[PDB]
RNA sequence: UCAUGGAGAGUUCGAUCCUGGCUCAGGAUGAACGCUGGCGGCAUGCUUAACACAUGCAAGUCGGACGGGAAGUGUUUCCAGUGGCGGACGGGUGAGUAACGCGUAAGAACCUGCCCUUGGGAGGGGAACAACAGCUGGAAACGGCUGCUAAUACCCCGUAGGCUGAGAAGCAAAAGGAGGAAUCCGCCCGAGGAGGGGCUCGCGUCUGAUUAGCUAGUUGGUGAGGUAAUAGCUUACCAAGGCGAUGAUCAGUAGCUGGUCCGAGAGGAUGAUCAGCCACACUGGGACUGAGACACGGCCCAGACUCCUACGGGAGGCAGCAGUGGGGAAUUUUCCGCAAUGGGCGAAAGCCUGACGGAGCAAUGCCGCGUGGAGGCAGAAGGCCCACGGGUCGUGAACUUCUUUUCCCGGAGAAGAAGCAAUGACGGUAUCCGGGGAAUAAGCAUCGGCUAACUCUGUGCCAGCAGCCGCGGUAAGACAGAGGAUGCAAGCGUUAUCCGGAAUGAUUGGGCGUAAAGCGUCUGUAGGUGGCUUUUUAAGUCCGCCGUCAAAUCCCAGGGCUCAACCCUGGACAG
């Protein structure tokens, strides 16, 4: 690429950084209403019952989103509220379900790091 | 005309102003073609600059009111 | 009727001046209309030239008339009127330009 | 300001004159001297220019739409 | 002297070097959610649906232009109407607009009420139109005949350093009001200037060739018109031009810039509040008056939509401020005041300003402050762990004294307001003085490596965690709990967006034998670069001077708020 001509025409761009969420497009999470509550399981080296919400979004997608913690309420048409985050051991879990927010309880009896859960205080 | 006007410059419960001759039809923090002044009146100076402001009035900008006032604090006034 | 008008006050006014500078741009019209008529038939066929022009300088003179008139009313900003009496001008001196009276520069 | 010296394109068009204007410009990023053409319609009442002679652009009151100069002689200093 | 700037780590493999990709450590948000939550100062507060909008308010004013009438009993306050300016400013939003719209820099063909300077003028007449009175139509909204009236309202004649025209010639204006006067505000015609606009042009102004031709008022010329002014602005005829592979045309995206954030730097991304310019005002299209609009709260028409109707018809534009509803993860009070400041009007008095000045809610952000200070026998109670010796929570607490930022209970109490006095929404706020009293006040992440912090109990490829590597099949420094520790602190974390790291788009700064990559080779157009000497112009280049790049921001130095944040004054390199 000399200075003169192969690059006064242009060098490239790169694209962007790419979108490590195709929905949640505005910005950060996204109301979100249960479809399926299944549970699949991981690949190869790991071996778990990872029990995912396929959730419809506000947005226009659809989008099959990962339960953190232990318990769980989550029952058929309620409405959850989706986050980004990328769940490796499952193929196409891309997000995560917010615990604490509305209609997704806390979980049940967790006294270390609460506010990735929403749970309140005890004592 | 142009008419000779403070505008506020400072915080809240502040009133440093300054003295600006600007054009009537602006808003009244605008632009200038020369900010000639100064008026703090809590407690401080007052820098006037005296050859612009006959500069200005011997053009025909008139003041508004208290800055006439402050015009007639000092003797300004000359009519040449 | 209701406390405050203040721009149905306009509309009524902007009505009435409506009426009075459409009439009387309408007047100009018509008189420049006149003198432009009548100098095109003695542009056409008159057969005698420097005798019957003082018809065509009363009529125009009616037209500087009216066109000087709504000059002074604000309808008219200088170089409208000056454009137009230029422009009756200029067709006078076009219809003496073809003919008799000999004009160079 | 400067006037645009230049070569005339194609003069067939009373009192009308397509100019080339060379112009050298610092491309931004990369920092060579880039040219850059852009021709002009002239104005000439004389319309005494060829093809190919060369001119000098000075701005004037606008004549048509893309008619805005008159180019009347360079200096010729060599 | 200048320098005030550049960090790595993990992961391919049994290992090693390397290429290369991903991921993290750093900042920033107009942010959102979770846990937790003492105060203060200053900012910020629909990013989405330019999506509809209930209610109130957001633009008036002038009786010293005029006529009437309606309270008060010579005297004054008001008033619908005709007039005068203001409604084109101020406010709001970014849908469009890839374009002289913007930014910067020149130019000539123009206009300009209010504003200064300046030369001259204001005789004479006359007709109505509102108002009003009567009749009458309508539920309303509005009207319709009949008469009448005034003016700074309209019309005519004369007069004019103006205009038209080659000249000849013609053409054109006025208004009075206040006051006893004095005089002042005006009016008409000119001539300048300032400021404000209207135009034109050089240069800069996003991506896509899987969009290659476009353009016929199109590009020129003349004549006729037109505009405040130049102009295909418009029209008739003539010429065939004009743009384009340096991206025309089409498609898509986008308000732009001072700036913000990042970066060592070059520059990358971006355009909230602050400020300047543009555009829009329910969706479209028109014109009217005025100096100035094709006018957010003007008019007329069409379209869609909501309200009223007595069924014939009317009325309406919150992207003004507050507010409701919807959408959304998410963005507030249907507040006080014209005291200042700035507008508009008026001779003044004053009036009106949801601009603006304040207040309220929200840790939304930046900054400051507290939750105690000092001592505390090294003796006890307890949690956790232990080679059962003990260790560690731990001077920590308990406990003794000191203090009161804050907290409570009382007193005082501002400037902000402008030399005639008076004039404060904020607010009895800020600040100060006195009386108790440690009292009223610490959480949230993490502890496998990056990455500071670790052991124990339970679970047994389950539950789960996870930013990347990967932990988890019986003793897990990686899950869950406890203890302890770490880092932060009224905050702490996760997520999203952007830059860094990234030399991972490379000018500074990369590569092409084998790692991704040299066309199969050759001719050659456009274009790019180019031998030596001498001479000339200076376009580039360099130096001086000058103009400008608004103000605010950033940098330096001072100054003010008890400091800081923030505010203010002056200065300037770059470029």
Same mark, same amino acid.
């Given at each position: ?123 | ?80 | #009727?209701?406390? !405050?008008? $203040?721009?149905?006050?306009? @509309?009524? &006014?902007?009505? %009435? ?17 006149? #003198?432009?008529? !009548?100098? $095109?038939?003695?542009?056409? @066929?008159? &057969?005698?030239? %420097? ?27 200088? @170089? ?26 | ?78």
């Amino acid at each position: 690429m000399p200075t003169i001509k192969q690059l006064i025409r242009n060098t490239r761009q790169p694209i962007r950084n790419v979108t490590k969420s195709p929905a949640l497009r505005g910005c950060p999470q996204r109301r979100g209403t249960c479809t399926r509550v299944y549970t699949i399981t991981p690949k190869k080296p790991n071996s778990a019952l990872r029990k995912v919400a396929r959730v419809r979004l506000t947005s226009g997608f659809e989008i099959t989103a990962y339960i953190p913690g232990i318990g769980h309420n989550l029952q058929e048409h309620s409405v959850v509220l989706v986050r980004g985050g990328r769940v490796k051991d499952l193929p196409g879990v891309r997000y995560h379900i917010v615990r604490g927010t509305l209609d997704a309880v806390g979980v049940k009896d967790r006294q270390q790091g609460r506010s990735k859960y929403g749970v309140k205080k005890p004592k | 005309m142009v008419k000779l006007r403070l505008k506020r410059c400072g915080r809240k419960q502040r009133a440093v102003y300054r003295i600006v001759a600007i054009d009537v039809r602006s808003r009244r923090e605008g632009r200038d073609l020369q900010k000639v002044g100064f008026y703090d009146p809590i407690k401080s100076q007052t820098y006037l600059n005296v050859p612009a402001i006959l500069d200005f009035l011997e053009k025909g900008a008139q003041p508004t009111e208290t800055v006439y006032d402050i015009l007639k604090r000092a003797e300004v006034f000359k009519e040449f | #009727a209701d406390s !405050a008008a $203040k721009r149905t006050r306009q @509309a009524e &006014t902007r009505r %009435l001046r409506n009426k009075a500078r459409k009439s009387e741009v309408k007047t100009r019209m018509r008189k420049v209309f006149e #003198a432009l008529d !009548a100098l $095109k038939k003695k542009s056409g @066929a008159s &057969t005698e030239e %420097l005798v019957p022009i003082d018809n065509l300088i009363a009529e125009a003179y009616s037209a500087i008339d009216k066109a000087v008139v709504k000059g002074t009313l604000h309808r008219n900003t200088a @170089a409208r009127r000056k454009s137009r009496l230029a422009r009756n001008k200029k067709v006078v001196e076009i219809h003496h330009g073809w003919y008799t009276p000999s004009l160079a520069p | 300001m400067r006037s645009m010296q230049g070569k005339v394109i194609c003069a067939t068009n009373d009192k009308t004159v397509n100019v080339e204007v060379v112009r050298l410009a610092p491309h931004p990023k990369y920092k060579r001297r880039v040219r850059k053409k852009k021709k002009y319609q002239a104005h000439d009442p004389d319309n005494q220019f060829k093809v190919g002679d060369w001119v000098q652009l000075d701005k004037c009151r606008p004549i048509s739409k893309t008619k805005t100069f008159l180019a009347v002689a360079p200096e010729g200093r060599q």
